[PDB]
Design an enzyme around this catalytic site. Structure first.
Site, PDB file in Angstrom:
ATOM      1  N   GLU A  87     -43.797   4.372  13.757  1.00  0.00           N
ATOM      2  CA  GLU A  87     -42.443   3.895  13.965  1.00  0.00           C
ATOM      3  C   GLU A  87     -42.047   2.886  12.898  1.00  0.00           C
ATOM      4  O   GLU A  87     -40.936   2.957  12.359  1.00  0.00           O
ATOM      5  CB  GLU A  87     -42.309   3.260  15.359  1.00  0.00           C
ATOM      6  CG  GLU A  87     -42.387   4.246  16.524  1.00  0.00           C
ATOM      7  CD  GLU A  87     -41.228   5.227  16.584  1.00  0.00           C
ATOM      8  OE1 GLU A  87     -40.261   5.075  15.813  1.00  0.00           O
ATOM      9  OE2 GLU A  87     -41.309   6.177  17.391  1.00  0.00           O
ATOM     10  N   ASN A 107     -29.599   5.203  13.469  1.00  0.00           N
ATOM     11  CA  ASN A 107     -29.588   6.553  14.003  1.00  0.00           C
ATOM     12  C   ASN A 107     -28.248   7.215  13.724  1.00  0.00           C
ATOM     13  O   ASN A 107     -27.245   6.552  13.449  1.00  0.00           O
ATOM     14  CB  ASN A 107     -29.860   6.527  15.505  1.00  0.00           C
ATOM     15  CG  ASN A 107     -31.205   5.926  15.824  1.00  0.00           C
ATOM     16  OD1 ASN A 107     -32.202   6.251  15.181  1.00  0.00           O
ATOM     17  ND2 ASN A 107     -31.242   5.031  16.807  1.00  0.00           N
ATOM     18  N   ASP A 119     -26.175   8.553  15.668  1.00  0.00           N
ATOM     19  CA  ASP A 119     -25.092   8.270  16.602  1.00  0.00           C
ATOM     20  C   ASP A 119     -24.520   6.871  16.420  1.00  0.00           C
ATOM     21  O   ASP A 119     -23.583   6.508  17.134  1.00  0.00           O
ATOM     22  CB  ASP A 119     -25.553   8.445  18.059  1.00  0.00           C
ATOM     23  CG  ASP A 119     -26.688   7.507  18.456  1.00  0.00           C
ATOM     24  OD1 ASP A 119     -27.128   6.691  17.629  1.00  0.00           O
ATOM     25  OD2 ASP A 119     -27.136   7.582  19.622  1.00  0.00           O
ATOM     26  N   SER A 165     -26.360   4.035  16.820  1.00  0.00           N
ATOM     27  CA  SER A 165     -27.310   3.065  17.329  1.00  0.00           C
ATOM     28  C   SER A 165     -28.311   2.721  16.234  1.00  0.00           C
ATOM     29  O   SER A 165     -28.389   3.385  15.199  1.00  0.00           O
ATOM     30  CB  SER A 165     -28.061   3.608  18.541  1.00  0.00           C
ATOM     31  OG  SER A 165     -28.802   4.766  18.186  1.00  0.00           O
ATOM     32  N   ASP A 210     -32.538   1.341  15.636  1.00  0.00           N
ATOM     33  CA  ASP A 210     -33.885   1.097  16.143  1.00  0.00           C
ATOM     34  C   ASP A 210     -34.456  -0.159  15.495  1.00  0.00           C
ATOM     35  O   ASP A 210     -34.318  -0.354  14.279  1.00  0.00           O
ATOM     36  CB  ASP A 210     -34.818   2.270  15.840  1.00  0.00           C
ATOM     37  CG  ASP A 210     -34.437   3.537  16.557  1.00  0.00           C
ATOM     38  OD1 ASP A 210     -33.604   3.514  17.470  1.00  0.00           O
ATOM     39  OD2 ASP A 210     -35.039   4.581  16.228  1.00  0.00           O
ATOM     40  N   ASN A 230     -34.412   1.141  20.605  1.00  0.00           N
ATOM     41  CA  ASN A 230     -33.098   1.664  20.253  1.00  0.00           C
ATOM     42  C   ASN A 230     -32.017   0.886  20.990  1.00  0.00           C
ATOM     43  O   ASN A 230     -32.108   0.699  22.210  1.00  0.00           O
ATOM     44  CB  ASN A 230     -33.064   3.153  20.623  1.00  0.00           C
ATOM     45  CG  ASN A 230     -31.819   3.870  20.160  1.00  0.00           C
ATOM     46  OD1 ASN A 230     -30.800   3.262  19.884  1.00  0.00           O
ATOM     47  ND2 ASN A 230     -31.891   5.201  20.117  1.00  0.00           N
ATOM     48  N   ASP A 252     -39.921   3.982  32.275  1.00  0.00           N
ATOM     49  CA  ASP A 252     -38.674   4.629  32.728  1.00  0.00           C
ATOM     50  C   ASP A 252     -38.811   6.135  33.152  1.00  0.00           C
ATOM     51  O   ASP A 252     -37.762   6.698  33.541  1.00  0.00           O
ATOM     52  CB  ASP A 252     -37.591   4.405  31.660  1.00  0.00           C
ATOM     53  CG  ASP A 252     -37.547   5.477  30.570  1.00  0.00           C
ATOM     54  OD1 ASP A 252     -38.233   6.521  30.630  1.00  0.00           O
ATOM     55  OD2 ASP A 252     -36.782   5.254  29.604  1.00  0.00           O
TER      56      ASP A 252
END
Length: 129
Positions: free
Chosen positions: A35, A46, A48, A50, A52, A59, A101
């Site tokens: 990562e 990203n 969209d 967003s 990270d 994110n 989650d």
């Protein structure tokens, strides 16, 4: 800060990630390697819009607030900048929420594609017991 492999393994162990939700330390170190290359200051945008953040590339679409991700949620209740600290506490606590989650470590696309099923214990070979 850029951690060494064993230095990061030790730090994650101290913060309770060893076998957290059943994921051995090597899984977490492997995920961090791919990562962020162990760099707490890593950021990546990203498609969209967003971003990270940090050693585990958490994110802004769901987990932290950076003020520039329309529709974001901030479920770890932290500014995304906290995920860039040399002290990995915020990143670890948020990662605990993420991995709890429902989808485990599959939340980290790079873990799924590069660590899952591999000999992740190699990532902690040589670290102090």
């Amino acid at each position: 800060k850029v951690f060494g492999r064993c230095e990061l393994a030790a730090a994650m162990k101290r913060h309770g990630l060893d076998n957290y939700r059943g994921y051995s330390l090597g899984n977490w170190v492997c995920a961090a390697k791919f990562e962020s290359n162990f760099n707490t200051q890593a950021t990546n945008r990203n498609t969209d819009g967003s971003t990270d953040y940090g050693i585990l590339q958490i994110n802004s679409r769901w987990w932290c607030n950076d003020g520039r991700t329309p529709g974001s949620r901030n479920l770890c209740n932290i500014p995304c900048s906290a995920l860039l600290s040399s002290d990995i506490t915020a990143s670890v606590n948020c990662a605990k929420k993420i991995v709890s989650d429902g989808n485990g470590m599959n939340a980290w696309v790079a873990w799924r594609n590069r660590c899952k099923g591999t000999d992740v214990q190699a990532w902690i070979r040589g670290c102090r017991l």
